[PDB]
Design an enzyme around this catalytic site. Structure first.
Site, PDB file in Angstrom:
ATOM      1  N   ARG A 119       5.344  11.325   6.546  1.00 55.44           N
ATOM      2  CA  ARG A 119       6.185  11.936   5.514  1.00 55.44           C
ATOM      3  C   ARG A 119       5.309  12.991   4.842  1.00 55.44           C
ATOM      4  O   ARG A 119       4.149  12.725   4.530  1.00 55.44           O
ATOM      5  CB  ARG A 119       6.652  10.905   4.478  1.00 55.44           C
ATOM      6  CG  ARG A 119       5.676  10.659   3.334  1.00 55.44           C
ATOM      7  CD  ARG A 119       6.176   9.610   2.336  1.00 55.44           C
ATOM      8  NE  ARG A 119       5.104   9.213   1.427  1.00 55.44           N
ATOM      9  CZ  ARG A 119       5.056   8.058   0.772  1.00 55.44           C
ATOM     10  NH1 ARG A 119       6.024   7.166   0.913  1.00 55.44           N
ATOM     11  NH2 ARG A 119       4.028   7.782  -0.013  1.00 55.44           N
ATOM     12  N   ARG A 151       5.967   1.166 -16.263  1.00 51.89           N
ATOM     13  CA  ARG A 151       6.220  -0.142 -15.675  1.00 51.89           C
ATOM     14  C   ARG A 151       6.510  -1.200 -16.728  1.00 51.89           C
ATOM     15  O   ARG A 151       7.316  -2.095 -16.495  1.00 51.89           O
ATOM     16  CB  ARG A 151       5.036  -0.574 -14.810  1.00 51.89           C
ATOM     17  CG  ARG A 151       5.044   0.114 -13.466  1.00 51.89           C
ATOM     18  CD  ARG A 151       3.697   0.172 -12.798  1.00 51.89           C
ATOM     19  NE  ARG A 151       3.849   0.789 -11.492  1.00 51.89           N
ATOM     20  CZ  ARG A 151       2.892   1.465 -10.866  1.00 51.89           C
ATOM     21  NH1 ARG A 151       1.705   1.611 -11.436  1.00 51.89           N
ATOM     22  NH2 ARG A 151       3.123   1.999  -9.675  1.00 51.89           N
ATOM     23  N   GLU A 203      11.438   2.839  -9.260  1.00 51.78           N
ATOM     24  CA  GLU A 203      10.037   3.205  -9.543  1.00 51.78           C
ATOM     25  C   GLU A 203       9.874   4.719  -9.742  1.00 51.78           C
ATOM     26  O   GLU A 203      10.010   5.495  -8.792  1.00 51.78           O
ATOM     27  CB  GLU A 203       9.098   2.757  -8.416  1.00 51.78           C
ATOM     28  CG  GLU A 203       7.601   3.027  -8.703  1.00 51.78           C
ATOM     29  CD  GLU A 203       6.995   2.102  -9.778  1.00 51.78           C
ATOM     30  OE1 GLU A 203       7.465   2.109 -10.941  1.00 51.78           O
ATOM     31  OE2 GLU A 203       6.036   1.364  -9.455  1.00 51.78           O
ATOM     32  N   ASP A 253       7.099  -0.735  12.905  1.00 47.20           N
ATOM     33  CA  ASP A 253       8.157   0.018  12.248  1.00 47.20           C
ATOM     34  C   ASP A 253       9.514  -0.669  12.258  1.00 47.20           C
ATOM     35  O   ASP A 253      10.278  -0.547  13.208  1.00 47.20           O
ATOM     36  CB  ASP A 253       8.267   1.422  12.862  1.00 47.20           C
ATOM     37  CG  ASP A 253       7.011   2.277  12.606  1.00 47.20           C
ATOM     38  OD1 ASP A 253       5.920   1.924  13.118  1.00 47.20           O
ATOM     39  OD2 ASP A 253       7.110   3.300  11.884  1.00 47.20           O
ATOM     40  N   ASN A 292       0.819  -1.200   0.000  1.00 45.60           N
ATOM     41  CA  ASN A 292       0.000   0.000   0.000  1.00 45.60           C
ATOM     42  C   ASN A 292       0.857   1.255   0.000  1.00 45.60           C
ATOM     43  O   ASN A 292       2.080   1.196   0.174  1.00 45.60           O
ATOM     44  CB  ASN A 292      -0.897   0.023   1.223  1.00 45.60           C
ATOM     45  CG  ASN A 292      -2.161   0.811   0.992  1.00 45.60           C
ATOM     46  OD1 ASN A 292      -2.158   1.835   0.300  1.00 45.60           O
ATOM     47  ND2 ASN A 292      -3.259   0.342   1.578  1.00 45.60           N
ATOM     48  N   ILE A 293       0.210   2.394  -0.198  1.00 43.88           N
ATOM     49  CA  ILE A 293       0.916   3.656  -0.199  1.00 43.88           C
ATOM     50  C   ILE A 293       1.581   3.827   1.156  1.00 43.88           C
ATOM     51  O   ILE A 293       0.986   3.507   2.181  1.00 43.88           O
ATOM     52  CB  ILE A 293      -0.043   4.831  -0.412  1.00 43.88           C
ATOM     53  CG1 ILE A 293      -0.654   4.750  -1.806  1.00 43.88           C
ATOM     54  CG2 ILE A 293       0.698   6.155  -0.227  1.00 43.88           C
ATOM     55  CD1 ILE A 293      -1.801   5.710  -2.019  1.00 43.88           C
ATOM     56  N   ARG A 307       6.841  -2.483  -7.490  1.00 40.66           N
ATOM     57  CA  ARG A 307       5.506  -2.636  -8.055  1.00 40.66           C
ATOM     58  C   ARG A 307       5.645  -3.147  -9.477  1.00 40.66           C
ATOM     59  O   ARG A 307       6.738  -3.153 -10.048  1.00 40.66           O
ATOM     60  CB  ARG A 307       4.700  -1.340  -7.990  1.00 40.66           C
ATOM     61  CG  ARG A 307       4.085  -1.133  -6.602  1.00 40.66           C
ATOM     62  CD  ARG A 307       2.873  -0.237  -6.640  1.00 40.66           C
ATOM     63  NE  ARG A 307       3.080   1.025  -5.941  1.00 40.66           N
ATOM     64  CZ  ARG A 307       2.739   1.237  -4.680  1.00 40.66           C
ATOM     65  NH1 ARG A 307       2.182   0.268  -3.979  1.00 40.66           N
ATOM     66  NH2 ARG A 307       2.927   2.424  -4.129  1.00 40.66           N
ATOM     67  N   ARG A 334       5.159  15.006   1.613  1.00 37.22           N
ATOM     68  CA  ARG A 334       4.690  14.631   0.285  1.00 37.22           C
ATOM     69  C   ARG A 334       3.414  15.403  -0.036  1.00 37.22           C
ATOM     70  O   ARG A 334       2.305  14.963   0.270  1.00 37.22           O
ATOM     71  CB  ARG A 334       4.432  13.125   0.210  1.00 37.22           C
ATOM     72  CG  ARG A 334       4.370  12.601  -1.220  1.00 37.22           C
ATOM     73  CD  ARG A 334       5.705  12.046  -1.680  1.00 37.22           C
ATOM     74  NE  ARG A 334       5.577  10.639  -2.050  1.00 37.22           N
ATOM     75  CZ  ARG A 334       6.549   9.741  -1.939  1.00 37.22           C
ATOM     76  NH1 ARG A 334       7.742  10.093  -1.468  1.00 37.22           N
ATOM     77  NH2 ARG A 334       6.322   8.480  -2.271  1.00 37.22           N
TER      78      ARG A 334
HETATM   79  N1  LIG Z   1      -0.736   2.808 -10.621  1.00 32.31           N
HETATM   80  C1  LIG Z   1      -0.956   3.937  -9.871  1.00 32.31           C
HETATM   81  N2  LIG Z   1      -2.049   4.690 -10.050  1.00 32.31           N
HETATM   82  C2  LIG Z   1      -2.261   5.783  -9.332  1.00 32.31           C
HETATM   83  N3  LIG Z   1      -1.396   6.174  -8.420  1.00 32.31           N
HETATM   84  C3  LIG Z   1      -0.287   5.476  -8.176  1.00 32.31           C
HETATM   85  C4  LIG Z   1      -0.018   4.313  -8.903  1.00 32.31           C
HETATM   86  N4  LIG Z   1       1.163   3.820  -8.464  1.00 32.31           N
HETATM   87  C5  LIG Z   1       1.619   4.596  -7.522  1.00 32.31           C
HETATM   88  N5  LIG Z   1       0.752   5.629  -7.300  1.00 32.31           N
HETATM   89  C6  LIG Z   1       0.857   6.759  -6.374  1.00 32.31           C
HETATM   90  C7  LIG Z   1       0.770   6.449  -4.878  1.00 32.31           C
HETATM   91  C8  LIG Z   1       1.586   7.614  -4.274  1.00 32.31           C
HETATM   92  O1  LIG Z   1       0.879   8.759  -3.812  1.00 32.31           O
HETATM   93  C9  LIG Z   1       2.653   7.866  -5.346  1.00 32.31           C
HETATM   94  C10 LIG Z   1       3.463   6.715  -4.823  1.00 32.31           C
HETATM   95  O2  LIG Z   1       4.694   6.403  -5.430  1.00 32.31           O
HETATM   96  P1  LIG Z   1       5.644   5.509  -4.531  1.00 32.31           P
HETATM   97  O3  LIG Z   1       6.794   6.492  -3.961  1.00 32.31           O
HETATM   98  O4  LIG Z   1       6.116   4.442  -5.465  1.00 32.31           O
HETATM   99  O5  LIG Z   1       4.564   5.054  -3.450  1.00 32.31           O
HETATM  100  P2  LIG Z   1       4.653   4.465  -2.010  1.00 32.31           P
HETATM  101  O6  LIG Z   1       3.450   4.954  -1.324  1.00 32.31           O
HETATM  102  O7  LIG Z   1       4.693   2.868  -2.154  1.00 32.31           O
HETATM  103  O8  LIG Z   1       6.004   5.076  -1.404  1.00 32.31           O
HETATM  104  P3  LIG Z   1       7.550   4.636  -1.473  1.00 32.31           P
HETATM  105  O9  LIG Z   1       7.807   3.632  -2.682  1.00 32.31           O
HETATM  106  O10 LIG Z   1       8.401   5.977  -1.714  1.00 32.31           O
HETATM  107  O11 LIG Z   1       7.912   3.958  -0.209  1.00 32.31           O
HETATM  108  O12 LIG Z   1       2.063   7.494  -6.615  1.00 32.31           O
END
Ligand SMILES: Nc1ncnc2c1ncn2[C@H]1C[C@H](O)[C@@H](COP(=O)(O)OP(=O)(O)OP(=O)(O)O)O1
Ligand SMILES: Nc1ncnc2c1ncn2[C@H]1C[C@H](O)[C@@H](COP(=O)(O)OP(=O)(O)OP(=O)(O)O)O1
Lengths: 229, 229
Positions: free
Chosen positions: B158, B70, B34, B207, B10-11, B94, B160
């Site tokens: 964070r 991707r 990514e 964590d 998840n995000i 991803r 963002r």
């Molecule tokens: N396929 C998608 N469609 C819409 N939004 C997406 C998609 N993939 C990623 N996102 C979004 C979610 C986030 O707000 C932003 C996330 O990028 P990313 O940094 O890879 O996410 P994350 O939440 O997994 O953090 P991190 O990888 O930095 O730990 O883009």
């Protein structure tokens, strides 16, 4: 290997008519149909209408659907018919190339596509055509050329809901794109292949739709063109 | 042949953190980055922001840009490094699959994607993955699993910009998608390959970002998982 060719031209210039004529004159020839009935009804919703009513909102989406469609058909395998002929010919109604150089390009230039949409679209286009390079090859273009107003007349001569709203200016734009690409070669291309491809210019300002003289006169130029490919 | 794996989650669950940890522990391993910095600045305009501010307007466009990205990375050739190792491993942040089954799917279900957009998107997705089938293969998924609220906390922990506006509900949705696909197998898949792929479930509710105990404990499970592929 079959000779692949695509018919290019402005809206309503008379493509479908010119095709019926081809079908009748050269039956061995295979004509890959153009998805217009699949755009008015997506299977539910009329994308074509949407693109016309809210160009700034659906142009990009439309382009992605038409590009995919044109790419699919150009990647499909040759039919068994086409297989067994001394001189096989495959004809496409518009191409993977006009999707970009005629409409997408124009849609960007007239503001229907944003910078982001144009950039993503091109990114896609150049990428896939490079990956599929060896399978989308074309040997020549049959450009059904005619003036904007002539087209505008024909455009209105046929109802077509989606279209009733197209101004002369729009057709003039598309005309420009065709002239710049197929005639003056002033449109920056991004594919080495597309560089020097034969282009048969057929002048159809005069309604060949009925004059059996001009029809026989067109098919003649076509045959001469195709055979020297 | 290198073992290909993609990290799903998840995000904010902590993917980037988990990757830094991987990089440090298994340097031979190759981690394909990514595109997040390429979405906030398209090179000009923040697509990521746009998708979040007007989901009903930019979700489809966003998905087409992320899917292409991707797909590109999954088609790229293995580096020379990865080439010369006894057990080469390639890790993706991803995948081409989560683009569809996590976000696109969810964006449709929550109304950000229209029926037309969902249909075109799927059409594209299924088509290209079929054409590129032999090159996008993955051997397993590392699912960084954690509760929505835990993520929501980290999400807010964070800054963002783009994200500050994400409600708990959204994360709950995405959580559902992951659980349905990687755990309960209740998400209809459209690729025979994707059917039965190994899934390493790492519970990161606590964590691990700092507790060196759990980090060594995670890498251990990872190593065990990867080696039996
Ligand atoms: N396929 C998608 N469609 C819409 N939004 C997406 C998609 N993939 C990623 N996102 C979004 C979610 C986030 O707000 C932003 C996330 O990028 P990313 O940094 O890879 O996410 P994350 O939440 O997994 O953090 P991190 O990888 O930095 O730990 O883009
Ligand atoms: N790439 C495109 N982008 C936007 N609109 C397009 C694109 N290609 C075709 N169209 C439009 C123009 C028309 O209004 C409708 C035309 O489909 P089509 O019937 O193939 O055009 P046409 O004007 O050449 O007529 P016909 O082939 O029936 O003689 O879709």
């Amino acid at each position: 290997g079959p000779r692949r060719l695509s018919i290019e031209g402005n809206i309503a210039v008379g493509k479908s008519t010119f095709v019926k004529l081809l079908t009748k004159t050269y039956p061995e020839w295979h004509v890959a149909t153009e998805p217009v009935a699949t755009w008015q009804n997506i299977q539910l919703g009329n994308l074509l209408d949407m693109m016309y009513r809210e160009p700034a909102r659906w142009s990009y989406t439309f382009q992605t659907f038409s590009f995919l469609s044109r790419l699919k058909v150009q990647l499909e395998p040759f039919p068994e018919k086409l297989l067994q002929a001394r001189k096989p010919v495959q004809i496409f109604e518009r191409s993977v190339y006009s999707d970009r150089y005629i409409f997408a390009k124009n849609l960007f230039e007239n503001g229907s596509l944003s910078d982001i949409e144009w950039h993503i679209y091109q990114d896609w286009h150049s990428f896939l055509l490079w990956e599929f390079a060896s399978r989308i090859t074309l040997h020549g273009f049959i450009y059904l050329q005619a003036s904007p107003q002539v087209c505008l007349k024909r455009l209105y001569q046929r109802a077509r809901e989606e279209e009733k709203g197209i101004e002369l200016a729009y057709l003039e734009q598309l005309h420009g794109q065709h002239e710049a690409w197929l005639i003056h070669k002033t449109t920056k291309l991004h594919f080495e292949a597309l560089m020097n491809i034969p282009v048969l210019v057929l002048d159809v300002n005069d309604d060949f739709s009925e004059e059996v003289t001009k029809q026989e006169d067109l098919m003649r130029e076509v045959n001469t063109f195709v055979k020297n490919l």
